Amino acid sequence: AHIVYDDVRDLKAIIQALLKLVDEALFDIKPEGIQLVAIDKAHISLIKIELPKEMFKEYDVPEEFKFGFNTQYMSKLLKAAKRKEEIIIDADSPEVVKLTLSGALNRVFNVNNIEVLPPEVPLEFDIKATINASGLKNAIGEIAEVADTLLISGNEEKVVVKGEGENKVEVEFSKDTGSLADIEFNKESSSAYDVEYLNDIISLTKLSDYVKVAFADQKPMQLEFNMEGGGKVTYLLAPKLS
Ligand SMILES: [Zn+2]
Ligand SMILES: [Zn+2]
Ligand SMILES: [Zn+2]
Ligand SMILES: [Zn+2]
Ligand SMILES: [Zn+2]
Ligand SMILES: [Zn+2]
Numbered sequence: 001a002h003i004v005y006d007d008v009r010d011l012k013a014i015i016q017a018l019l020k021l022v023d024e025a026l027f028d029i030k031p032e033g034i035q036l037v038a039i040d041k042a043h044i045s046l047i048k049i050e051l052p053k054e055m056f057k058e059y060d061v062p063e064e065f066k067f068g069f070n071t072q073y074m075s076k077l078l079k080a081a082k083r084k085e086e087i088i089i090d091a092d093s094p095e096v097v098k099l100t101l102s103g104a105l106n107r108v109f110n111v112n113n114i115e116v117l118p119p120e121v122p123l124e125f126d127i128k129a130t131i132n133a134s135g136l137k138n139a140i141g142e143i144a145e146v147a148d149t150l151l152i153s154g155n156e157e158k159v160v161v162k163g164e165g166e167n168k169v170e171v172e173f174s175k176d177t178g179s180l181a182d183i184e185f186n187k188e189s190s191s192a193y194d195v196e197y198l199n200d201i202i203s204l205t206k207l208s209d210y211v212k213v214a215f216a217d218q219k220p221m222q223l224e225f226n227m228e229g230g231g232k233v234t235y236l237l238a239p240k241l242s
């Protein structure tokens with residue numbers, strides 16, 4: 001296997017979110033691309049990653065292999081990688097993966113593979129809204145500072161998020177707020193979620209300018225981050241009743 005990706009910052013943002021859900025995870029490296037699924041202990045939130053070969057500068061993987069890793073270990077390896085730089089992965093045997101960070105002058109890490117079994121992995125929505133990622137990020141952070149639950153409601157024109165309780169750090173996403181690019185509307189809906197979980201994965205918002213937010217009354221919220229080249233990271237969060 002030999003892979004070159006043009007921007008280590010995206011892997012960094014993915015690892016920052018994963019370490020909040022799990023201590024270990026598994027990249028399933030196949031000839032057509034890389035996949036990963038991680039679910040937290042309580043089976044309340046999950047992250048799925050799909051990185052097709054088409055999104056990499058170089059991707060030559062004649063044989064599949066599973067790369068198990070400790071999320072905090074990888075976060076610290078990547079810690080000193082602030083600028084957009086290439087990351088090269090070459091693995092000739094199961095046991096170790098060589099990661100080379102380019103630019104910001106050369107760092108090479110030989111990472112030993114560890115055993116990690118993939119979650120025993122098992123979607124209809126009332127509203128699916130494409131909204132400004134930074135706007136959502138701001139909203140999640142502000143609500144988390146003052147509430148424990150984020151309420152979301154949507155109709156044919158907008159999605160509104162606010163914290164549950166007295167006054168409201170309320171934020172509206174719509175064309176008239178210049179933050180909604182598109183919306184698929186089936187039925188007006190309102191749901192509730194633990195904002196602590198959403199704040200944990202806020203780094204995924206660096207992956208794309210827009211995020212597709214999908215939900216239905218008392219059903220999971222789904223956030224989809226579509227990346228350039230066909231990449232997609234999906235975050236799923238179980239609902240509260242209200
Ligand atoms: Zn090879
Ligand atoms: Zn190469
Ligand atoms: Zn090789
Ligand atoms: Zn109405
Ligand atoms: Zn109407
Ligand atoms: Zn909570």
Ligand SMILES: [Zn+2]
Nearest residue numbers: 020196197200
């Ligand atoms: Zn947490």
Ligand SMILES: [Zn+2]
Nearest residue numbers: 149164192242
């Ligand atoms: Zn509540």
